[PDB]
Write a protein that binds this ligand. Structure first.
Ligand code: CA
Lengths: 34, 223
């Protein structure tokens, strides 16, 4: 999850950038969506 | 699972792990051939892992079975997460035993206040790196429709409910998606989404399984 209060699904997903992540999830600094 | 406890090996025998090279979502076994998960957990070539406790160590009770069919609800919306349910058919039937067992579907919807069991291999911290080896568990109550809708203005559909604690601290989190919310021995929810994990006023949001019993039975009957 980011700080915008958007819909962030609770899937575990490796990422490099926000567009790798579902819904309003962002790619956190550890390289996982949240 | 944040703020939870270690379940104990195979104490949640209907819990499965969905694996695509790594664990990414949970699921619930509902008969020897079918698993219920979240629509947003769809991938091609899923491997279902049953009888798991430590997902990173072969402990001897696992069954690894490839998905032959992964059927997303026809009305699933990937922006709103409305209709966030998927059925996975196993390529071969799981061998049912004490450590690999099905969970019953509901015959009606559970009321607010009902206590449930939520489980998975999701992050055990709300943020950062804390992805567990063994299955974690949380007891949490279904929250009122009004509490849920006030917590998430305009974001809650008829196919979603909130469970957890408005004070925060205890919640499902990334990696728990698709897994079970079980209340009084029935599968009432599927881990779906939230704003963060375990934050005050932001309880977890779950797919309302009771709305899909007809669809589940029809899909199983025709596939
Ligand atoms: Ca294992």
């Amino acid at each position: 999850s980011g700080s915008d209060g958007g819909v962030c699904p609770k899937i575990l997903k490796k990422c490099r950038r926000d567009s790798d992540c579902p819904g309003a999830c962002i790619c956190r600094g550890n390289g996982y969506c949240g | 699972i944040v703020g939870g406890y270690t379940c104990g090996a195979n104490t949640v025998p209907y819990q499965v792990s969905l694996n695509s090279g790594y664990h990414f979502c949970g699921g619930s076994l509902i008969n020897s051939q079918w698993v219920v998960s979240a629509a947003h957990c769809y991938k091609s070539g899923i491997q279902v892992r049953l009888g798991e406790d430590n997902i990173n160590v072969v402990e001897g009770n696992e069954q690894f079975i490839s998905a032959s069919k992964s059927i997303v609800h026809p009305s699933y919306n990937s922006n709103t997460l409305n209709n966030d349910i998927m059925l996975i058919k196993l390529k071969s039937a799981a061998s049912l035993n004490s450590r690999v067992a099905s969970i019953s579907l509901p015959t009606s919807c559970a009321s607010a206040g009902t206590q449930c069991l939520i489980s998975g291999w999701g992050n055990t911290k709300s943020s950062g790196t804390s992805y567990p080896d063994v299955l974690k568990c949380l007891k949490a109550p279904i929250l009122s429709d009004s509490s849920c809708k006030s917590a998430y203005p305009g974001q809650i559909t008829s196919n979603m409910f909130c469970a957890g604690y408005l004070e925060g601290g205890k919640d499902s989190c990334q990696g728990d998606s698709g897994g079970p919310v079980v209340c009084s021995g029935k599968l009432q929810g599927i881990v779906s989404w939230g704003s963060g994990c375990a934050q005050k006023n932001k309880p977890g949001v779950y797919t309302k399984v009771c709305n899909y019993v007809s669809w589940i039975k029809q899909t199983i009957a025709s596939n």
